[PDB]
UniProtKB/Swiss-Prot annotation, chains A, B, C:
Modified residues (Phosphothreonine): 75
Keyword hit for Mitochondrion: yes
UniProt gene name: RIDA
Family: Belongs to the RutC family.
UniProt keywords, alphabetically: Acetylation, Cytoplasm, Hydrolase, Lipid metabolism, Mitochondrion, Nucleus, Peroxisome, Phosphoprotein, RNA-binding
PANTHER family: 2-IMINOBUTANOATE/2-IMINOPROPANOATE DEAMINASE RIDA, 2-IMINOBUTANOATE_2-IMINOPROPANOATE DEAMINASE
Enzyme class per UniProt: hydrolase
GO annotations of cellular component type: cytosol; mitochondrial matrix; nucleus; peroxisome
Main localisation: cytoplasm
Name this protein carries in UniProt: 2-iminobutanoate/2-iminopropanoate deaminase
Length: 134, 134, 134, 135, 135, 135
């Protein structure tokens, strides 16, 4: 009696696989729920060296590759969550995010957690909506 | 001038009541926002004994009962958040989640928080979409 | 080949500006993703004095002003996340939330984080849906 | 990739059996396309006696039963077409029609055709939208 | 449980008053069903003089005012039906019609009926969709 | 503020060129309004010989090519209108029609008009909905 909505798992070899029985992202109707991305190199399965700035760059690259696999780019992001091992890294992570966001300004929440998977210093979750968007 | 979308509070006696002025879940349009579930026994109002594995089983059972009250099951879950008191319990919680998920693979984020309500070792939030889904 | 959905940035001078390259909220289709709000006075750019109860009041006022800028009020909220510097403040924050929620009962998650931006004791994120709603 | 929309054939034995390769109505998404109804008795398939006024009443009754089978009533109708064998019957058929469409009057077109199946004096087609509808 | 769709009667004094139990148009969700319009002067309710060409212009003007009341213009029309008293007028009415539907031409059907209300020579019905529409 | 719905003109050289200011079909959101088709050969624009049965086959073939251009087939049709030059041809045209609409029969109206363009014996209009449709 109701319409059947499209639900698609998004998969790309250009981002790491999720840790656990999870997908990199799920598109449902037009909304894309992207799993939290760490600064993990898809080729090594481990964090990139060099600390939070390098990890933020890698995490955002990983998000970007998942967005591309769903026909999207950073302009489609509507909400991000920035999870930090150290609140004092917030500015530095925001400076990296400003380099990837294609001038988009999604809503966001940010906070320091007690620990991230793989000893990460940053993890970014995102929600996007498939275009076209006004 | 715009359509009136369906918004329904989901309530079931087979899951604990939310802590505070919150509902167990809200269905709006076709999206179900499920409150974070702890390993609380609906009959005792307290955590089940035995630690994080037992609590994860109870939390997932609680999610399952809320999904059922909304006409859904684990195949409808599109995003989960796994909140942990100890990051080292992530694998063990993922092994329990693999027992309940009906082979679904939602998007996910996971991290260790400083503390959960009721001294919980695990809390799981979920977003589902009411079917049919492709 | 697909409809173009409305995406609008919500901005109001009656709430503080977001910290970083983010918007106060984004409306997309009918869903409003509200950035996490701290107990920051829009006039000072700093936390209000007096502790978590005062900060919770200010954070909720800030959410309320963002909702109003999107044509909504607290009855439109469907999911909240209550982030705390101290889990022991959960009841006190819930008592403030009960004063602002216009009897709405959204789904919710709550937990203690390691740290919030600006040394906040509380941060509240929300998802709302633009009415009319049944 | 696009959502799969609901498409259902509406069928009720309380409206006449088919006289051609046509469904009584088709619901698709929320819109209901109702076949043109004649003033035919549902049990026998024969036109009711009494001319255009009685045929109009029966045709509208038949539409009503099709609407009911789709979980609707006459308030769900948004467009009708009134096909007349004689334009002179315009006022008389309108008087019957107003008794069924008592509020939120549908959009309509009315005109005289050269002939209707079975020698009918009136045929009425309609489009409805499945509720809830907020007026 | 289903969403409650918007259904609104469209009414403007800039188009003729009703000659039957019909709304000028009904907007439902985003689709606008427009009643068949004759070449009737809105103030008097009398057909305009001059035959089919003038009646067509007036009928289209009336449609235009109904569209305007629904926040639309002729570019929102997606389907029309041109009902003629005389098939020979097909080309002449098409020449008038093309002056109003200047782009994104609607789908249409055109044919001769036996008679129209008020002795009209042309009646035009339409379906439109409320914008924004992305062509 | 409202979403911008897709509106596209459907056009195929495998169906006849226009005889008036009309699109072969208009897709809007998911609904396809198909212009009335005559039994016209697409290459020449001339009616096919053989009378109503052959004209019906050709008109339905033309609809089929328009549907194909919109990524649809006859199972996407939800409503048709069969306009006849002679009501006596009702049964014969229905026999042809059933060969194209072999399942999920559309809602329909059928009746005799006074005349069709080009002296046609039959004209068929349709509404379809772009799939996927779940019956």
């Amino acid at each position: 009696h109701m319409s059947s909505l499209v639900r698609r798992i998004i998969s790309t070899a250009k981002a790491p696989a999720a840790i656990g029985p999870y997908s990199q992202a799920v598109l449902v109707d037009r909304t894309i729920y992207i799993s939290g991305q760490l600064g993990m190199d898809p080729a090594s399965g481990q964090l990139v060296p060099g600390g939070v700035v390098e990890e933020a760059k890698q995490a955002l690259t990983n998000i970007g590759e998942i967005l591309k696999a769903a026909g999207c780019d950073f302009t489609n992001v509507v909400k991000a969550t920035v999870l930090l091992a150290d609140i004092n890294d917030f500015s530095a992570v925001n400076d990296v995010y400003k380099q990837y966001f294609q001038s988009s300004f999604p809503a966001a929440a940010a906070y320091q957690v007690a620990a991230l998977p793989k000893g990460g210093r940053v993890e970014i979750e995102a929600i996007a909506v498939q275009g076209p968007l006004t």
